[PDB]
Every structure is written in structure tokens, then in C-alpha cells.
Design an enzyme around this catalytic site. Structure first.
Site, PDB file in Angstrom:
ATOM      1  N   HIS B 167      21.635  48.520  36.211  1.00  0.00           N
ATOM      2  CA  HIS B 167      21.667  47.027  36.150  1.00  0.00           C
ATOM      3  C   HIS B 167      22.912  46.490  35.443  1.00  0.00           C
ATOM      4  O   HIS B 167      22.928  45.303  35.009  1.00  0.00           O
ATOM      5  CB  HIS B 167      20.464  46.444  35.379  1.00  0.00           C
ATOM      6  N   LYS B 304      49.518  48.930  33.080  1.00  0.00           N
ATOM      7  CA  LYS B 304      48.383  48.182  33.641  1.00  0.00           C
ATOM      8  C   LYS B 304      48.462  48.359  35.161  1.00  0.00           C
ATOM      9  O   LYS B 304      49.277  47.741  35.844  1.00  0.00           O
ATOM     10  CB  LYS B 304      48.422  46.698  33.235  1.00  0.00           C
ATOM     11  N   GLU B 311      41.121  48.400  46.638  1.00  0.00           N
ATOM     12  CA  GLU B 311      41.193  47.116  47.385  1.00  0.00           C
ATOM     13  C   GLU B 311      41.404  47.339  48.888  1.00  0.00           C
ATOM     14  O   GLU B 311      40.792  46.651  49.720  1.00  0.00           O
ATOM     15  CB  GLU B 311      42.299  46.199  46.809  1.00  0.00           C
TER      16      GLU B 311
END
Lengths: 437, 447, 437, 441
Positions: B167, B304, B311
């Protein structure tokens, strides 16, 4: 060969579909880079020599001179960053070849981010697709159908409900219904324009506008409106919504999906009416695109296939639209591909269907009337003259002997004091039954 | 009027004028399949004494050029054409006749190149050849690459313990290895799903002619053609249809195969979403793993990396789901003796095969293979979870265990350090017993 | 809490928290939860973990639930926490109450849920129910439909008619051949459902919270499954190949739903052909007559609407399936609702369609043969006797006068030296042209 | 053979026996719309002098009981019935005739209760009445509640600065307020989208009779019945169809309206996914906000799970509607009961879940404001404004040191000894003002 190191790496990273951006997408990116350079110059942030060179390079791209310079796959980074930088790198190369040095990021991307530029170009393309391509094609189709509705205003035939014999209608009435479905299609596309035309430009990386000059977006949109003649282009109502989501694309695809549903009905009825001749309905003749005519309904087949493609493309658009995260939805190139293809297929097939099928349809009015005149559906007005039992016997015998109801009533000896020939003709007037307005 | 370098003729040129709809024609693999089929048909017609050797051999040689991809520029007809694929069938017949003619042999596109055939049995045959070849020779091997990459990483990470998430909330320990074995199973099952479609995907309509009856083809034409096709392609999956009417009135095998591709798209979405979440941040995210940087630039700033392959994968999956809806729509809407949605169905299923093949390999080799995990740390974090205090109950009681959990969270310490801090090491339990009870790798129960 | 309610506090809270659809679990889902709880209690007893008195009361209570005696005791909305924890607790509470009223105190969590988590229980019950639906309900209904279609294929093996391709006249076929094609589609649907069973029957039980089996005894899942197989007689039930995959995803439901989706596609074609064959009579094809329940084709309408529902349900299942996170997919109740409904709708409508539509169809054989013998499609076999130019003229005159090809050949004075009556009848033998095998 | 307490008659019992498919009949709203329609038809027939006042008033009274929900147990016919919905039309006529008879007035289900109507213009009218009521009176008010809840958070958290996230990776600052303003706009646009479908959703087929021509209905029957419906429902969106043939040959208005619901599902999926991610953990997740709860605290995001599952259902239902919509033939689309089921369910699920999500999840969210601001102030994303003071090299060294040591940028600049004549503390705090970087409008 005008792209640089970044685009080259993206070529290596995404060999997935082998297909890149379409003409309209490259056009939109060119238009946007020109408008951004203009505004950056207007504000005194970009030196006029640099800006005018960018503006000229961007105009070449928009005009379609460098479509071979956009090799990056549709299936790239989901912000469209790769295509953004592709546009920057290409513009820089063009400027430098005209002896003016500009930096792809610092100059061509000045005041911008990928995250506000690629969705802006997508919405410019999609808005232009709706307004300058699809609506006019739908109007061609509505007009062809409406013209048939008028030509066939008195062409009475049998209605069909559940595929079963029903009371009379005219071909003109049925075609008015198809024309209304396409008119409603146009209303549906127009209803999406207030949100489809919203642009993210000026929101920069996360929607806050950080590192863009005050009012940058308003000024760029102003230039875009004047360059495209599309007053539907506007600044987003909410800068975060316009980057975190692509809901306007999901909305517009929904209208295209409704049009696909309407076209499936119209095309299906048309190929059914054209069917046979011997084994089918043989109600109309479609234009053919030593021996008797048997025209395959090729345009209805192209329309129904296009509609299936729009249905599929629409499912892909919604799937991408649902899956944004936080400040950015990263399904933009995939969503852009699908909605723009749907606009293109519907634009092109609507014109062909109107002009090379609908317009040249023919029908035999005399025959279709004689057939409506043969239907058990029309015996009802006889009940009060001949009773329910004789009426049912008339209907059975007419079908068996392949005669009109009128002739069967005559053949069964029912003409007399209770039913004259002129009364029979009045009660069985199938054109009057269609209640033409 | 026809372009000068063009090997097509009048019927093709008319179809070019009739369907300017998408601006896209048949893919390389569909053209190759048409070539293969026309060669095999000419071989059988020659074998049977129906087509003179000089004509048949010229057709076979011409069809081989097409199959080998020498003439992909000779197929200009839109995907959105007559729903039987007749236009593309005629395109192939015309191009073959032109090639034969330029070699000094006159053959008729219909009477010779299309001898014993209809478009209604040929175009769906070429479609099923291309789809079968895509599944067997391209997608399954790409999925095997992906499965192996996931399974290799699962073994590497066999002891890399971390907290589970259910969850999206903190749960008991699992290893990164265990999670990756789950991803590997999804791909292994994807391969099983594609294989399960082969008995029906491989059925070919050839020999059924105009309506499924085989009228105007010699007895056993289909069986003979299929035999040649199997020999030439090395695809033993190609077979005659169980029922010749079903094989033309419907394209249910494409609908079925697309369903398998859709399930794979669903699995890939789960796998890619997890991996980009695990890579997220660094500061605002989960920072569980590091993805390979596919866009490095000169920089003195902390790294980063954008998850560009996850994607690409998730966008590909969306496309496969849309394509699959398109295939099912065409599949439902046959009438009587023929389903006339073939070119549209073929486009969508073959594209889904291509996208999945290409992205699976890229995802495996340029993303999965080079993932790294932050491991001594993932463990310190799992050792800090209130989820692990249960095994303390039978030494210190559930109320003290609960207080341990609260204090651990408040002072941002391990459960172990908190137990020490609260002075419980002594009569209640030894340090060795505490370490046994809080062994988070052991709690993952690695098989 | 209602007086006759056997559920307790956690359930009444779930009732208050999710007033969304107002529909709760179906009978089959309730039954599977009961079966599961019984099997767990048996194993915990076997392992000496649960005292026999407690286990036997649980086993007897779970059997009442499995037998459909408490379908009114499960009020929680389908749209609940996505693990189905609420329904798991609902089951535990109901069992506790039944045991209690038989004089045995058991704890819903510590006893009824012993060795279990919701995360492995609810998907297990879901897959039990789906496997049961496939094996014991749908496949037998599809077999009834396949048999009815095959029976017609045999009955109508010589009922020659014209084929239709693109909806246009084509060379002869038999109604029996067309029905053999429908029968194959249904036979293939059965193969499709069978092909999903190896993964549909995989159960998560024993994986506990995250898939590791923490807090369950060694081999708990295998032991529970052994009991389930023995009770249900379903050898398709099995422990999952990978315990993580079985909780992180519900891919086996996506897979099984795909087979139902293909059956929906097949049924759409079959039902569409049947209502078209029965259409008119005057305005349509008038090939066959459907049993009355001018009859409207109400069962083909029910079939095509069911198929639309299955398509939609299947889209919902896939959407849920793709969206798991980490150790748990939390779309289980929604996915379960949709796949189980698709099984039920297809089961019930397939039997009805077979028995109340297909079985009683009658064919208008003379109208069918007369049309086939009148078709320009059958003149080709005359070429070698009369030439393609005369054959064309025969076709044209036949159409103009509405005569058979045979009669037209006679009427044009072609019988004699060109060809004999016997030769004409051989060349125009339309049943022979269908080439029945 | 018919049950004793049953007000339906022979045609309905035959339909019960013919379609045992799903075991589910019409919903309350559909039954209600059928009663409303039958009352309006009887009123108009009485007005025109075609139906005797004693019969019409008995029909009007019966229809009102049905519209009031007094007989929702008298409609046993499956959803999967004849695709015109003729069986449910006859079910209504029979139940009305039984009620009239119980009240001492003989009326004929066909000749009287169905007077001026056909088997094909009635069920789609009742469907579009129910869908229009659902949109106007139920869904839009629930979306307004949700819009207000989200807009309230946008204001409450207008200064609650945090780090943006793009591609799931650290980005420049935003506020929680700004993000919630984005959600509120999505719901506001969702209301715009539903409103945009009303000119066509509200079109009614009544008066077109069997094939759309109005054969055997009085002149202007449709217009007159619509006027009564508008007055009785207070829904001025109910209107006669633009084209009577399009209104029966197709159900394109339902496909359009379903599309707006589908977009709302897409928007809700994004909002709910973000909210459960923000609430994730605590230790393993983002721990940005705490969700209301419906050993230390660990609240499962049950309402975001309910919302995302509802959204999936709406997406599936939307596919079913479109599939039915495309497949009409000639004068009639025969997928009406299935299309009605799916679109009306989507209205109901979105209505109920939107209100619950708003009141029981959004309203009571709390934000971990200190942890959020401290994290934003610790991001390498904010060092760029230091470049002109300390140079690129030290700015980068500061970003690296801050991450390694888990410190703010500010404290790292101090720790590196960079405060001096080129940079005061006052200047440092101006340059690293993360709330100002969010540029709250």
C-alpha cells in the site's frame, strides 16, 4: 546533418519504433522557438544579432526545410526533452552556418525549460489540427450528407429496426441523421477548444515560472496567436495543472473517439445499403473506385478501419494522461503521437468519404417506393376497413407472391363498398407515412 | 501516370490516389512475407504442372528479391486500404511482373503471379507469417534477454535486505533479489503467454481462395504451400488452418496474440514503475538504487539521473494497450465469409511486437544490467523499522516492544540500538539473542 | 450492528467507510473465502498450531459459508481497500460468530486468520473463484454452444447459398460451412481459456504479508492447496511459481480476461451473422428464421451487449493489473469483480444463445439455392463452352429478367451443339461449387 | 405464472424467463425516469383529449409512485434484454396498469399507458433523463465539494514550501498549496467538461415513435412531453432532439458524456496517486503529509485506493459505452440497456467516491511543514543563486557537502567558511529564500 552530441546520444538511446516527430510537431517547435526568441529580444535579454538569427532559423524549421534533422524516436524521455534539445541544436547549427554564434541552451532555450516547451508545442499542434485541418474536413462531410438529405427528401423506403422490417422513412431523413452526427462531431471538437488551446509556456521547470521573466508566457502566446492566426491559443488557467497533467489532450481525444463512433454507424449503413446486389439490400449504388456492376465498399472499409485506429489511439492517450506524477506528466511524446494521428486520419478519410463516396451515391426512387409498398408494416391503416384477420392474410400473401400490399388487397377481392381503390391508395400512401418535414 | 523508377503498375497507382489517409504503407516484415508467399505459390503451381517453369522461376526469383528487402520502396499503398488487403496483394503481383519483365520474361500479374490464389486468402496468410516470425524470431529472444538480466540482478542482490512496501507503507523485510526474481517471473510468464498463442497464431488461410471453399485452387494447394513456407522460413509453427472458414471470416488468432502482448505491457509497466521509484530523488525520493546515466554531461554537481528507459518502457506499454484495443475492434467486426479489417489489425499487432522487442532489449542491457544498490544502508534502514519488533515479544513482551518501536522512530535509531538504550540487555535477553531476533536478512527467509 | 448480523466491528466500520457502489462480493467470491478459511484451519490443526476444538468449529463454520448459507453476511463494498483486507476480516468475523453460537470461542485474527495475511488470502480466494468459474461453469457452457453450432453445421451441410465478401455477392458456400466456422471459433475459445489455466490457478496462499512466508509455517501454502484440490476437485489449483510475482501482480487475471475478451470478439461475429441471416424478411437477407421468444433477434442482441460488457470489463482488469507497487497490487477487489462478471455473463448467455436461438433455427433453403443459381458469380464455369463474352451477356440478362443462370442460357438458345442440358447442369452445379469436405 | 405480490404481468414474466444472464435489473434512477416519462405522456395525452381523464389521472398517480421509488421491486427484467429496452418499457406499462387497477380504474398497458409512444423512443428518453439528472443533480455537486476541499488546501498550504519533483527526481521549490491548486483546477475543469456535454446529453427522443418519423404520435407530442418533464424535474437541460433520426439511430450523446467521465477518472487517478505517495512510509516513503485514519501510526491510503479502483471501473465502463454506441444499424441503436447501465454506474461511482475522498481524506490532511521546508533548504537545486557570490566551484562543493553531511545549503556555506565581505548572512538568506523561489502568485 545539423543536430549535435545530445541528439546523437538520443538516437543511440531510443531505437524503438524507428519513427520520429511528424511535420506538425516540428512546425510547432519551430514556431515556438521563434516566438521565444522574439520575446527575449523585445525584453532586451537576447542580443538582436543572436535573436534575429534564431528567428530566421526557426522560420526555416516551421516552413518544413529541415524535417530530415529530427531523427529522435517518439519513444524518448517523457518530457520531450530530447526533441526540445534537437530543436535547439539544429537552430544553433543553422545560425552558425549564417555566421552568427548562438548557444543551444543559453540562447535558443533562454527563459525556457523542456517541461513547459514540449507540452506547448504539442498543444499548438493539436489546436491547429482541430481548427485548421479537422473541423473544415468535417464541414465538407456534413455538407455532402446534408446535400444527399435534400436530394433524397422524397425518396421513400422501408425503415429497419433490429434489422427487421419497419414503417416507412426516406433516404433523405436517414441521411439528415448522419449529417446531424457530423454536425454534433464539430460541436464536440469545438467544445474542447477552451482547454485544448491552453499552453504551458512560461511555467518553466515545475510550473512556478522560476528563471522566466515576468509575463514571459503571456507575451509568447501573443506572438503565437499573431503568427498562427489561432486565437484559441491561450495561457493555461493554472500553470501546475498545465504541466502535471495533459488532461486537455485526453478531453480532445474523447471528442475524436465520439466522431469515430458516429463514422462507424454512417459507414456501416452505407455499405449495407450498397450490398449485394443479389445477396444484399441493393438500396443504393456506391461510386466505383463486360460484366454487371459489383462495387466493393472500399471507402466505408477505410472509414471503419480509421475509426478502430482512433479508438485504440484514444485508449493510449488516456493511459498516458492518467499516469503523471507530482509536477510533471512524462507521457507527452506518446500522447502527442496518438492524438495527432487521430486528427490526421479523421481529417483525411472524412474528405475522401464525402467526395469520393457520399457525393456520387445513387438510388432508384421508383423501386425503393415499390418495395416500401410491399411491406407488412404498412397494413395497419387497413385494420378498420378489413379487420385484423384479413389484414394478416394480406401481409402473408403479399410476401409469398412478391406483390405490393395494394395489389394483394385487390387480388383478394377486398375492393368494394367498405374499401374503394382511392381509399386504399390513401391509406397505403407510404410517402405520407414517412411524415416528411 | 506512374513514376519512372516504379515497379508497380495501374492498380497500385489507383490505390495510391484512393487512400491518401495516413501516408504510411506496409512495414518491411509485411512486404517480406508477401514476397515469401508469392514465391511459395509459384513453386507449388510449377510443381503441379499449372505454371510453365520459365514463368515460375522468374516469379520465384522476383519474389526472393522482395523477400530479401530489395524493393521496400515499391509498396506505396496506405495501410488504410480495402479491408481484405487486395490493393497490397495486387501491388505485390504488379511489382513481381515488372521485375520478371525487366529480366525478359512476360508474366501476367493476375493470371500467373496470383494463380490459384485470392486476396482473401493471401493477405491474411502474409499477415500471420509476419506475426509468427515476429513472435518466434524477435520477441521471444528479446524477452529472454530481459528475463536473464532480471534474474542475474536478482542473484547479485540475493542478500541485499531492505524493507517491503505494501500500500506504499512500511512492511516486513524482503531482499532486492526477491523483488527482482518476481520481475523475472513476470517476463518468464510473458514468454509462456506468447508461446501459448503459437498453435493458433501460426494458422494460415492459404488455399481457402475467395470464400474459404478452395474453389479454383488445386487439391491440397494450401498444404503444399505451407510445406514450402516452413522449409524456407524455418518456422515449424506455420500450419494450415484447422477450419478454412474461421481462418477467413475472422482474425481471432491476431486478437489472441495481441492479448498476450497486452499482458506483457501490463507486466512491464509494474517493473518499470518500481525501478524508477527505487531510483527516485535523491533527496526527495526513495534513493534505493542508482540507474545508469544515459545522458551524461560535463558537471561538478551531484549526480541526478532521469529514468529515461523506464519512461520509454511505460510509454511503449501505453501504445501496446491502445494498439490492442484497435486489434480487438477490427477482430469483432467481420461479416459472413470475410473479416475486412486486416491491414489495420496487421499494422497494430506487428507494431506491438516491434516496440516490445526493441524496448525489452534496451531496458535489459542499458538499464537493468547496470543498476547499483545502496546496500549497507538499505539494511540499516530495514533495521530501523517498527515492522521488525514482533520477534522481541517473547523476550520482552508486546508492550515493551511497542515502546521500543516508538522510541526508535523518535530518536531516528535502529530497533537494536533502542533495545540497548532502554537497558533491556541483561536478564531479559543477551546481545547475541537480540541479534538473532532482529536478523533482518533472516526475516526475509531467502529460499 | 444489525441483530441478525454475524459480522462485527471491523466490518461495520468498512460498511461506513466505503458507501460507493452499494454492491458487495458475489456468491462465488464468498464461497471461495469460506473454502480458504476451512483449508487453513485444517492445516493449522494438522501442524498442532491450532487446538482441535477451535479448528473443527472454524472448519464447520467455513463449510456453511462455502455452501452458500451466509451470502447475506458480507455487506462490504467492492470498492474497498485494494488488498481486500476488509472482506478478509469480514470472513474471519462471520466465522467467529458462527463458532461462538455453537459454543466455541475463537479469535477472528489470532485463530481464524492464523498463519495468514490479507495480502495472500484475498487474491487466493479470487483465483480459486476464477478457476472454478472457468473450469466448472464457462467451459461447459462453451461446449454446449460449440455442440449446437456443430449440429447445425451437419444439418445444413447441403444448404447451398451465395457467399458474401465485403458484403458483396461471392461464389457458393453452404450454411453448414459457415456454422462449422462458428463452431471452430467457439472450440478455439475453449482452447484459449484452457491455455490460461496453468497461471490462473496459481494461488498466493503461504506468502503472508510481502511474499516471504514470514509468520507462516514451512510449506503452509502447499499443504493448504492440497486440501483445496481435494475439496474442490480442481487440479488446476497450485502454489504460485514465484511468491512475489503472485502478490506484487495479478497478471494471471489479466491473462485470463484476455481469453474472455477473444471469446467476446468471436461471439460478436457469430451473433451479427445470425441476426443478419434472419433479417427482414422483406427489407433484409431472409436466409433463416430465428425462434420466437417477424421475430426480433433478441438473443443476438443480448449476446452482442454481453460482449461489449466483457470488452469494457477487460479494460478495467488490465488497468488494475498494470498499477501494482512493490510487494502488493492493490486493485484486487475491482479486478476480481470484473473478471468474475465476464465469466458469469459469458457462461449464461452462451447457454441461452445455444439452446434458445441456435438449436431452433430454420433455413429458407429454396430462397437460398434460387439466389445462388441466379448469381453472376457462377457464370465462369461456362467460359470454356460459350466464351467469356457470351457468359457476361448471360449474367446481364439473368439479372435484368430475375432468372437463374441456367434458364437464361436456355432462353438465349445456347443448348444444342455448344453444350447439352446435362453439361449445363454439371457446370452450374452450385452445391458442387461449394466443395463440401 | 406470476408471483403474488407482483405488479408486472405476462410480457414481463416472459422477459424474466428469456434473459437470465446477469441477475441484475434496472437501477433506482432508471426506474424513476421511466415513471416520470409515463406520467408526462399521460398528462399530454389527457391535455390533447386523447386519453379520458379518469384513465390518465390513474396513470399519472401510478407513475408518480414509481418516480417516488415506491416500486423498485417491480422491475425484475435483466439489464441484458432486447437492445431497444422494449421489455423494460412494457414492464413499466404493466406495473402502471396493475396499480391503476388496484385503485379501481381499468387501463390497457399498450393502448393506454403506451398511447402515442413506441417501443423505441421511450427507453432512450428515460435513459437520457436519468443521465442528465445524474450529471446535474448528483455528480456536479459532488465534484464541487471535492473542488472546494482541494481549493481550501491550496490556500491553507500556500506558504508550505517543499521540493518539486519531475521524472520523480529532485526539482526546484513549489508549495503544497500550488500543487493542490493544480488538483483543484483538474476538478474544476472536470465540471466544465461535464457541463460541456449537457446540450447533447439532455436531448430526448420522445415523439419520434418507431423509426424517428413521429408516425402515430400527435403533432408536437415530443415538444409537449419535454415541457412537462422540464416543469416536473426542474432540469431545463432536458430538450427535444435536434434531429429525431439521429436521436434513435444513435446514442452518441451517451458516448460523449462517458468521455467526460473518463477524463475525470484520468484526473482523479493523478490526484489520488500523488496523495498516497505524499503519505507513504513513514520510513520507506516520502512522509510529506499524513492522511486521516479510517504501536506507531501507519495509515493505509484506503480512500486513494478506492478512488483509483473507481477510476479503473469508469475507464472499463467507458469502453463498453463506446462499443455499444458504434454499433447501431439504420433507424435504431440496439445497445441501449448496456450503454445505460455503464454510463449511469460511472456517474454513481464518481459521485460517491468524490464526496468521500473530499470529506474523509482531503479535508483532514496534515502537512509535515518543518520537515518539508528543511528538505527544500537542503537541495542541490537551490545553489544556483550562490554562483555570483562564491563561484561555480564552491557552489558545487557546497551542494556535494550538504548531501554528504545531511545539512542545509545554508549551514554548509557557513561550514565551508564562505561568509565574509563577498557574502553576508543576510545576503545568504535572501539568495536561499526557498519560499520566494516558489514565486507564489
Amino acid at each position: 546533418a545539423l543536430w549535435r552530441a545530445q541528439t546523437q546520444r538520443a538516437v543511440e538511446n531510443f531505437p524503438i519504433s524507428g519513427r520520429g516527430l511528424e511535420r506538425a510537431q516540428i512546425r510547432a517547435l519551430g514556431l515556438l522557438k521563434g516566438a521565444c526568441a522574439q520575446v527575449n529580444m523585445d525584453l532586451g535579454l537576447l542580443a538582436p544579432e543572436k535573436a534575429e538569427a534564431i528567428i530566421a532559423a526557426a522560420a526555416e524549421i516551421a516552413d518544413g526545410q529541415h524535417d530530415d534533422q529530427f531523427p529522435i524516436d517518439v519513444f524518448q524521455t517523457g518530457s520531450g526533452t530530447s526533441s526540445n534539445m534537437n530543436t535547439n541544436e539544429v537552430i544553433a547549427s543553422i545560425a552558425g552556418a549564417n555566421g552568427v554564434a548562438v548557444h543551444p541552451n543559453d540562447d535558443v532555450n533562454m527563459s525556457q525549460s523542456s517541461n513547459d516547451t514540449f507540452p506547448t508545442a504539442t498543444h499548438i499542434a493539436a489546436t491547429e489540427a482541430a481548427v485548421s485541418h479537422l473541423i473544415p474536413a468535417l464541414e465538407i462531410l456534413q455538407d455532402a450528407l446534408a446535400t444527399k438529405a435534400l436530394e433524397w427528401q422524397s425518396v421513400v423506403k422501408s425503415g429497419r429496426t433490429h434489422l427487421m422490417d419497419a414503417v416507412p422513412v426516406t433516404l433523405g431523413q436517414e441521411f439528415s441523421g448522419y449529417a446531424r452526427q457530423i454536425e454534433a462531431g464539430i460541436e464536440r471538437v469545438r467544445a474542447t477548444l477552451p482547454r485544448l488551446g491552453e499552453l504551458a509556456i512560461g511555467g518553466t521547470a515545475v510550473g512556478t515560472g522560476l528563471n522566466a521573466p515576468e509575463g514571459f508566457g503571456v507575451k509568447v502566446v501573443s506572438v503565437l496567436v499573431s503568427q498562427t492566426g489561432l486565437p484559441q491559443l491561450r495561457t493555461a488557467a493554472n500553470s501546475f495543472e498545465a504541466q502535471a497533467a495533459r488532461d486537455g489532450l485526453v478531453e480532445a481525444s474523447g471528442a475524436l473517439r465520439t466522431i469515430a463512433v458516429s463514422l462507424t454507424k454512417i459507414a456501416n449503413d452505407i455499405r449495407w445499403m450498397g450490398s449485394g446486389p443479389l445477396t444484399g439490400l441493393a438500396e443504393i449504388q456506391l461510386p466505383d473506385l463486360i460484366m454487371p456492376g459489383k462495387v466493393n465498399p472500399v471507402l466505408p472499409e477505410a472509414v471503419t478501419q480509421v475509426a478502430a485506429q482512433v479508438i485504440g489511439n484514444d485508449a493510449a492517450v488516456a493511459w498516458g494522461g492518467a499516469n503523471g506524477a507530482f509536477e510533471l506528466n512524462v507521457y507527452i511524446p506518446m500522447m502527442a503521437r496518438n492524438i495527432l494521428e487521430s486528427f490526421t486520419l479523421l481529417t483525411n478519410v472524412s474528405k475522401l468519404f464525402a467526395q469520393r463516396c457520399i457525393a456520387g451515391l445513387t438510388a432508384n426512387a421508383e423501386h425503393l417506393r415499390e418495395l416500401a409498398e410491399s411491406s407488412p408494416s404498412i397494413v395497419t391503416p387497413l385494420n378498420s376497413a378489413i379487420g385484423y384477420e384479413e389484414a394478416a392474410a394480406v401481409a402473408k400473401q403479399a410476401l409469398k407472391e412478391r406483390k405490393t400490399i395494394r395489389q394483394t388487397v385487390i387480388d383478394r377481392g377486398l375492393i368494394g363498398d367498405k374499401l374503394s381503390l382511392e381509399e386504399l391508395d390513401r391509406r397505403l400512401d407510404v410517402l405520407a407515412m414517412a411524415k416528411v418535414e
